[PDB]
Amino acid sequence: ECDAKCQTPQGAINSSLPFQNVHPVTIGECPKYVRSAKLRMVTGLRNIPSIQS
Amino acid sequence: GAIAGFIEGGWTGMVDGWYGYHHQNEQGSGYAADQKSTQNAINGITNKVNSVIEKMNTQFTAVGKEFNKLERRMENLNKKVDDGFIDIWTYNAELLVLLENERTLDFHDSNVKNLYEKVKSQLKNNAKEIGNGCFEFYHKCNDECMESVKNGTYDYPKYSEESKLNREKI
Amino acid sequence: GAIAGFIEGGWTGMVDGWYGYHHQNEQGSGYAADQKSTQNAINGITNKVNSVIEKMNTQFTAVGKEFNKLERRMENLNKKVDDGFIDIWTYNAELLVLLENERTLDFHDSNVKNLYEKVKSQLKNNAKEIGNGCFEFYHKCNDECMESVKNGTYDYPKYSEESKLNREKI
Amino acid sequence: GAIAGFIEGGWTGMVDGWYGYHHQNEQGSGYAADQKSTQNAINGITNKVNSVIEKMNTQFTAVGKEFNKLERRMENLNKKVDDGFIDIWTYNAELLVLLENERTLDFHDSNVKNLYEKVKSQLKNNAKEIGNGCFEFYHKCNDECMESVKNGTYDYPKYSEESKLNREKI
Amino acid sequence: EDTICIGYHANNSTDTVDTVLEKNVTVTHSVNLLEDSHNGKLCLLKGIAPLQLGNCSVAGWILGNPECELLISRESWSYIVEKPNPENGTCYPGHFADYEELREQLSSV
Numbered sequence: 001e002c003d004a005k006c007q008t009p010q011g012a013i014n015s016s017l018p019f020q021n022v023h024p025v026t027i028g029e030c031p032k033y034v035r036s037a038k039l040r041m042v043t044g045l046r047n048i049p050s051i052q053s
Numbered sequence: 054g055a056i057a058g059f060i061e062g063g064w065t066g067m068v069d070g071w072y073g074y075h076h077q078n079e080q081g082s083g084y085a086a087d088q089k090s091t092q093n094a095i096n097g098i099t100n101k102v103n104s105v106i107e108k109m110n111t112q113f114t115a116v117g118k119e120f121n122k123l124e125r126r127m128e129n130l131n132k133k134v135d136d137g138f139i140d141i142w143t144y145n146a147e148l149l150v151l152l153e154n155e156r157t158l159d160f161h162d163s164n165v166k167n168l169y170e171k172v173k174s175q176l177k178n179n180a181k182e183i184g185n186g187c188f189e190f191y192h193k194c195n196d197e198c199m200e201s202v203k204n205g206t207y208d209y210p211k212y213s214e215e216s217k218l219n220r221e222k223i
Numbered sequence: 224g225a226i227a228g229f230i231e232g233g234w235t236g237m238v239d240g241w242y243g244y245h246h247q248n249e250q251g252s253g254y255a256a257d258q259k260s261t262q263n264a265i266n267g268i269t270n271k272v273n274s275v276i277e278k279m280n281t282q283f284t285a286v287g288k289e290f291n292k293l294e295r296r297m298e299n300l301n302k303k304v305d306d307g308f309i310d311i312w313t314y315n316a317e318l319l320v321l322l323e324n325e326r327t328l329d330f331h332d333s334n335v336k337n338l339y340e341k342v343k344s345q346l347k348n349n350a351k352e353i354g355n356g357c358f359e360f361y362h363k364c365n366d367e368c369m370e371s372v373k374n375g376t377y378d379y380p381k382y383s384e385e386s387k388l389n390r391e392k393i
Numbered sequence: 394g395a396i397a398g399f400i401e402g403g404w405t406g407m408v409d410g411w412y413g414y415h416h417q418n419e420q421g422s423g424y425a426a427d428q429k430s431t432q433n434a435i436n437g438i439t440n441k442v443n444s445v446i447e448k449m450n451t452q453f454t455a456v457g458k459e460f461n462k463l464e465r466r467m468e469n470l471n472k473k474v475d476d477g478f479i480d481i482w483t484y485n486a487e488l489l490v491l492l493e494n495e496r497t498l499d500f501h502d503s504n505v506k507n508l509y510e511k512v513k514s515q516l517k518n519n520a521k522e523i524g525n526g527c528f529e530f531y532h533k534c535n536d537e538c539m540e541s542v543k544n545g546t547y548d549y550p551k552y553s554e555e556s557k558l559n560r561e562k563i
Numbered sequence: 564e565d566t567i568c569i570g571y572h573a574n575n576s577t578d579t580v581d582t583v584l585e586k587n588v589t590v591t592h593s594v595n596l597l598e599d600s601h602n603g604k605l606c607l608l609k610g611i612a613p614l615q616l617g618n619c620s621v622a623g624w625i626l627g628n629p630e631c632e633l634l635i636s637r638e639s640w641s642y643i644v645e646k647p648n649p650e651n652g653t654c655y656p657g658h659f660a661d662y663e664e665l666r667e668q669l670s671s672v
């Protein structure tokens with residue numbers, strides 16, 4: 001009874017993101033499928049606890 | 054701990070932003086992040102991140118192509134094309150993520166240094182460059198002066214004469 | 224205006240190049256861009272720009288392919304291929320233009336600083352680091368000395384003794 | 394020659410690593426590369442190089458496709474596809490090689506400077522910034538002190554008082 | 564004596580990102596770009612319920628196999644669903660000429 005924007009042969013996606021690792025075959029407005037396992041961009045910085053903390 | 058920062062490490066007790074100050078006064082101590090540099094750093098990152106999604110167009114998908122028994126030449130060209138494009142895109146995404154994480158990490162440690170300098174050239178002789186990212190005031194100042202340093206005003210003549218004597222204590 | 228540069232802003236009145244000097248003498252004032260750093264910066268940019276066109280080969284074009292009624296499978300593979308390659312190239316160009324405009328903008332503000340330093344370490348005590356990108360001479364010098372600073376010679380012993388007394392005026 | 398380094402040039406006589414020291418003592422002279430910065434620079438480069446091969450997957454190859462006389466439409470699509478992918482890959486490799494050679498060359502000259510600074514802030518007044526990448530000790534020290542500078546200890550109070558008098562020789 | 568310090572932020576985050584020179588570098592903040600969330604449910608794309616053929620094949624469906632009973636308001640769909648190996652195709656055997664081509668004609672419907 002759900003409503004999607006992106007439909008795959010093994011489920012549906014929330015196409016906010018720019019890449020997908022689920023399935024290459026899709027219909028609707030979908031984020032481009034890639035083979036990659038982890039795609040994480042750094043916003044902050046290197047987390048270093050100084051002196052004692 | 055002995056407090057200090059920048060060259061020593063990160064401040065667990067600061068929350069307001071990424072870049073900030075500590076200060077040791079007679080009117081207490083604490084942390085206060087510089088939101089002007091933090092915003093002009095957040096804007097950058099937001100536009101770095103958004104510029105990656107805004108260029109990489111969300112595209113309508115259609116893939117499923119079917120070939121008969123005496124058509125395996127075309128079936129293999131469809132396979133060649135399907136895999137070929139996934140190949141380029143997986144490289145293209147994977148590279149930009151590694152290359153720009155490098156650029157984000159250098160961006161920060163530059164913004165930090167570019168602020169450590171903002172203060173060094175603002176105070177001068179009126180403080181010593183005590184061990185890593187800190188300054189030891191040669192004149193003792195009010196929270197009003199602290200917030201004068203933070204917002205770039207400071208006013209060097211007021212404390213110049215004061216420091217001149219305290220600096221001579223060698 | 225109060226003149227000054229680098230940390231303050233850009234010089235509308237300079238024409239000779241991108242990077243330069245102002246100077247305040249008893250023998251007049253003006254602007255004179257350092258063409259040695261400007262050329263060794265122009266060369267860089269020319270080779271950055273030309274290296275983008277020289278790699279991106281100007282290619283002979285042939286596109287127009289026609290398919291019948293009972294061939295729409297191939298018509299769609301031709302479409303898949305045609306659009307797929309435009310897709311990669313539009314990303315590839317659009318990214319390099321944004322990424323290297325970033326690198327050109329950092330290249331300059333580094334070349335500027337790397338010149339502000341050339342002078343700081345050339346003069347030393349014989350001048351104070353007066354408000355942003357300027358130096359206030361502790362000895363007063365001839366246009367010959369100015370052009371000695373510009374071409375890196377200067378000669379520190381000549382004015383060292385002179386400045387030693389004027390610096391002491393505290 | 395007059396020895397010196399960093400801003401002057403490269404040391405032909407150093408072997409231990411990329412970044413190092415010279416030293417002029419009463420207990421001889423020579424070269425000794427800082428392997429701590431050299432390793433934390435080798436690690437980087439090794440991971441830059443390996444990260445290029447580890448992402449660019451070594452792929453099984455199959456290319457040879459054959460078409461008849463009344464099939465030159467497909468023969469040209471196979472050609473379009475074959476050349477199209479070589480086109481992208483030749484650009485992609487050629488660009489990353491030029492762009493990251495640039496990043497490796499800046500990485501080093503930053504690591505060198507970031508070490509010239511390590512020492513400047515470690516010694517302070519106890520030495521003068523004599524012509525390019527060198528320091529002239531204001532107190533004369535044992536090979537034990539040299540290796541104290543190299544491993545970051547130094548100990549500023551020991552020689553502070555000594556230098557205080559020798560610095561005054563103006 | 565009075566002091567002042569410049570320093571960067573730090574928190575309790577386990578978010579490990581990667582670079583060109585460094586890998587598995589723990590950071591304060593980070594944002595993901597890869598999606599792995601499929602609900603395993605076929606939803607109605609746009610709001611248009613798709614064509615769930617069932618035990619039938621494309622051939623079966625359009626030729627009107629006596630089992631394929633969906634000749635109803637199933638004139639409007641968003642996309643077409645087929646069971647990998649569909650049991651109810653052509654009842655009387657034979658060959659469906661240029662079958663594959665027709666599938667693309669129906670794909671655009």
Ligand SMILES: *[C@@H]1O[C@H](CO)[C@@H](O[C@@H]2O[C@H](CO)[C@@H](O[C@@H]3O[C@H](CO)[C@@H](O)[C@H](O)[C@@H]3O)[C@H](O)[C@H]2NC(C)=O)[C@H](O)[C@H]1NC(C)=O
Nearest residue numbers: 618619620623627628629630631649650651652653654655
């Ligand atoms: C629609 O699909 C159903 C289900 O797949 C088809 O039913 C099955 O049809 C096969 C023949 O195609 C039957 O197999 C028979 O099995 C006996 C076993 O003793 C064997 O002696 C026969 O030679 C034959 O292989 C099977 O029984 C039959 N029933 C089921 C429930 O699977 C049906 O034929 C399809 N109908 C149409 C009109 O497409």
Ligand SMILES: *[C@@H]1O[C@H](CO)[C@@H](O)[C@H](O)[C@H]1NC(C)=O
Nearest residue numbers: 197200201203204205206207
């Ligand atoms: C900095 O804060 C002080 C607070 O008294 C104020 O007087 C001064 O004008 C501020 N400077 C700027 C540039 O906002």
Ligand SMILES: *[C@@H]1O[C@H](CO)[C@@H](O)[C@H](O)[C@H]1NC(C)=O
Nearest residue numbers: 367370371373374375376377
């Ligand atoms: C700089 O200019 C002066 C002009 O008198 C000249 O004597 C000197 O040799 C020049 N230096 C260099 C390195 O060209």
Ligand SMILES: *[C@@H]1O[C@H](CO)[C@@H](O)[C@H](O)[C@H]1NC(C)=O
Nearest residue numbers: 537540541543544545546547
């Ligand atoms: C540096 O070397 C000296 C050699 O006497 C040693 O005493 C000191 O602990 C070393 N410092 C570090 C941080 O390893």
Ligand SMILES: *[C@@H]1O[C@H](CO)[C@@H](O)[C@H](O)[C@H]1NC(C)=O
Nearest residue numbers: 065068573574575576577591
């Ligand atoms: C640190 O730990 C708590 C768990 O006790 C967590 O919920 C919190 O979000 C963390 N702090 C930050 C700043 O992320």
Ligand SMILES: *[C@@H]1O[C@H](CO)[C@@H](O)[C@H](O)[C@H]1NC(C)=O
Nearest residue numbers: 577578579580586587588589
């Ligand atoms: C480090 O990276 C490896 C990649 O193989 C991964 O298995 C491991 O879990 C990562 N560890 C951390 C702490 O991120």
Ligand SMILES: *[C@@H]1O[C@H](CO)[C@@H](O)[C@H](O)[C@H]1NC(C)=O
Nearest residue numbers: 617618619630631632650651
């Ligand atoms: C579909 O095929 C399966 C095969 O096991 C059968 O159990 C089911 O009843 C069939 N449904 C229809 C409507 O033919």
